[PDB]
Design a protein around this ligand. Structure first.
Ligand SMILES: O=S1(=O)NC(NCc2ccc(S(=O)(=O)N3CCC(N4CCCC4)CC3)cc2)=Nc2ccncc21
Ligand SMILES: O=S1(=O)NC(NCc2ccc(S(=O)(=O)N3CCC(N4CCCC4)CC3)cc2)=Nc2ccncc21
Lengths: 470, 469
């Protein structure tokens, strides 16, 4: 049983007592604050709204549990029982909050308002920032989605250059991060964010999250194929690596199959086992069912280059229309070790320099894709910008002397299209002057109800690359 | 509805067809592989066992769901329905797996076996590595707990050097990481791992996790106190920062309270607002209810030093018995911005060089404590070391030519004390020779039941620093 009264930073329990007396409105906003990563993919809030914020989230039992925990945690009575009982009694435990947000999947430059939060009942001035902690966790799917999309830009550039098209782009970066993230819940959230940009995942948890909270016309949003792990090779004994290979590719003779080849000696496995002993089992495979050789250790770029060099001398290589070398269609490579946005760039650039098409390879990333990210990468941040006290609205902000990068926006915010068609955030309620057309934010939550939502297919369309669009 | 059949890496669905035929046993182990962070706190497996692995985790409905999803995900029928049905029918859907583990809270050098996993029924040879993905997520609480203990070591060394004792050590690094982690579940797991070493947290999700899965004699494992955030200051308006401060310290006159002081100009706030205009409300406070001034921007060390210098000129400083300067007891500082293990060390060393006692300060860490960590930090890894095929045991391993650091251990494993009282992992079943006393791994899970558990109190005892001891 999740309890929203226990889902905040401890000190926020004490804040109701700290605002100016007679404050009736607290209005706050989220941005990826300006400080690469010039634009962000807005994704993930719809999950939070539905799983944690909508409907009857306050009960008499949840109030008593919070009172009991906070009494001990603070060694004192500081919990706002009265305020939460008000919500329970007046709104049948539905939050009197309104959230406006940019559509999911939207790609927006840094430093723009992405969502706003305000209370809808003056008695609940304290509630806006109570839920800061839970809403700010949107940084994670935004950040995964964004960093995944930045890797797609890299892959698109180099695939276009070396092959002349983008065929298969959406399967070039596979999610291997299930084991490397910090929890099951994170696994589903992060896997779903990667699927905004790609279709290949081993993180099965993402599929159910998307089905429940977003939806796709297709039965599932992402796909995989059979593959070995080191245990299914090493179990055969060190002298029987050939036997394991032969067994695995025969068991999966008619579908694609990846086979990890570096248990003992990747270069031997490629040149002597695959390239000589078992070559007859590879060159007979369908283009729809290639063997995908998997190195998994050594310098990522050097190992890929050396594997391709070996395979190129044992198998028939062609020269595609762009002048780049291409393995036969029954043979590919996957690099699933040490991949993050930086090493991905190094590997594709290294391949290009050695005249190997990016058609030859795909990448898997795990920790780099889903875990090695923090809230500082995009400076995702929630701040109060407007309050009403004693009936007077006031524009508020922070502006720390030693760090102008932490300055926050002032007053009521709105998001607009500029005359050149770009985004701009207007501060101080200036959107009301109607000089920049309509506010692009939409009301997505009001008074315990989700009022606007997006399918996963729409989110993917919104998050497309300009090259894909053109 | 969590479904263990859908809680693995997709490719593991296909592995049952890949092992050698006539394989009746797959035995695997977890270590924090050797390649800084020389020892690790084993913590978190009991959570995973209870939440996800115990009891009736296979049902007819879960089998059908898995079958339906994998048909679409693979665009093919490759799911082992027959093996999952067997578990359902023979064992009432309980997992035929035995897991042996070092006790939680144990502090073990890198490169040692921490737990092992094996199937208890020959038909379920494939199940040992099915649950790799879920068990390997133990890397996270191990790493949080380990990194938090390493920070407690730094604080202990500097507190002892500048003050002569460890009083309040367990409150010197507070968890501010709730907003900065990737999910609610991570929050609870990560906050609980930090609580192995400290008692201060704002990540309330940790408390419920510990109560449900571990348990403490005391009502709760962690504590906090009132504090401002920027909104409760800025809401007053720029010209009314002093009004906000005055209001807040008066609301919380008799308990400790932290007050963020950098909304506009931290140095002004310290020297003029706290140091002059509101000084009379500070110097009257109880030593049990100090004001804790919070800077939150700028270079973390330079800002701490400048704040201490400002305060030291507006308030009565003493020199403690070690020669270090000490604010009056009603006034302390908390640095909650930019703290990780590296910057923590820089700040305390900077303070020591400027003759400020670590008694003066506490630290809060959020993303650095709970998010900015990966499975590569301690090389937490799960590998098969032993199989039985055709009734013959075979010791198996990887040893990639280009990276000896990824070599794995061979055979059946056990963990022992050495004659000097250190730890050693015996390979190749050599523990059976009984030359090294009893195995320190204990059966913690077998055939769907959790067989040995630890209280959070025991875990804390096991994870103590030697200096505490
Ligand atoms: O490398 S693994 O052993 N594989 C794996 N899953 C199988 C796999 C194999 C091949 C590719 S691929 O990207 O080459 N790929 C996917 C899509 C492609 N086609 C499918 C649609 C059109 C292109 C087939 C090949 C992607 C994924 N999981 C792992 C998890 C953790 N570590 C390692 C691995
Ligand atoms: O800085 S905050 O505004 N505070 C806060 N919680 C209050 C707080 C205040 C002071 C200390 S402390 O370490 O000084 N401390 C002193 C008193 C307490 N006593 C418990 C027994 C002995 C000391 C221990 C914790 C720790 C924690 N939460 C935040 C969350 C996110 N960012 C910032 C903050």
């Amino acid at each position: 049983e999740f309890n929203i009264l226990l889902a905040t930073d401890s000190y926020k329990v004490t804040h109701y007592k700290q605002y100016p007396p007679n404050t009736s409105k607290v209005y706050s906003y989220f941005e990826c604050r300006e400080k690469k990563y010039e634009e962000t993919v807005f994704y993930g809030l719809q999950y939070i709204l539905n799983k944690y914020l909508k409907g009857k989230v306050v009960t008499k039992e949840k109030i008593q549990e919070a009172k009991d925990v906070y009494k001990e945690h603070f060694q004192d009575d500081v919990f706002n029982e009265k305020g939460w009982n008000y919500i329970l009694e007046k709104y049948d435990g539905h939050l009197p909050i309104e959230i406006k947000a940019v559509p999911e999947g939207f790609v927006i430059p840094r430093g723009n308002v992405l969502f706003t939060v305000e209370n809808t009942d003056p008695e609940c001035y304290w509630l806006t920032n109570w839920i800061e902690t839970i809403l700010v966790q949107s940084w994670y799917p935004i950040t995964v989605a964004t960093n995944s999309r930045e890797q797609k830009k890299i892959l698109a550039k180099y695939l276009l250059e070396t092959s002349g098209n983008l065929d298969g782009l959406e399967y070039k970066l596979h999610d291997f991060g299930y084991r490397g993230v910090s929890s099951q819940e994170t696994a589903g959230i992060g896997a779903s964010a990667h699927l905004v940009n790609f279709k290949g995942t081993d993180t099965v948890a993402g599929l159910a999250l998307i089905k429940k909270y977003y939806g796709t016309k297709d039965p599932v949003p992402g796909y995989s194929v059979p593959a070995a792990e080191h245990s299914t090779i090493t179990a055969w004994g060190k002298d029987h690596e050939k036997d394991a290979f032969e067994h695995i590719v025969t068991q999966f003779s008619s579908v694609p199959v990846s086979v990890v080849s570096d248990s003992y000696d990747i270069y031997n496995a490629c040149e002597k086992i695959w390239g000589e002993d078992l070559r007859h089992l590879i060159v007979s495979r369908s283009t729809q069912a290639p063997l995908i050789i998997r190195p998994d250790s050594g310098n990522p770029l050097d190992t890929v280059l050396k594997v391709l060099e070996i395979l190129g001398k044992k198998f028939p290589v062609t020269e595609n229309s762009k002048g780049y070398k291409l393995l036969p269609p029954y043979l590919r490579v996957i690099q699933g070790d040490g991949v993050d946005i930086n090493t991905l760039q190094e590997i594709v650039e290294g391949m290009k320099q050695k005249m190997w098409s990016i058609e030859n390879i795909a990448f898997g990333s795990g920790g780099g894709l889903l875990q090695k990210l923090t809230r500082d990468l995009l400076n995702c941040s929630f701040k109060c910008s407007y309050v009403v006290t004693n009936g007077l609205g006031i524009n508020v902000f922070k502006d720390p002397v030693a760090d102008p990068n932490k300055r926050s926006k002032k007053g009521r915010l709105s998001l607009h299209r500029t005359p050149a068609g770009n985004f701009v955030t207007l501060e101080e309620g200036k959107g009301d002057l109607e000089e920049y057309g309509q506010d692009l934010l939409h009301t997505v939550f009001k008074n315990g109800k989700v009022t606007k939502s997006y399918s996963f297919d729409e989110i993917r369309k919104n998050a497309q690359l300009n090259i894909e669009l053109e």
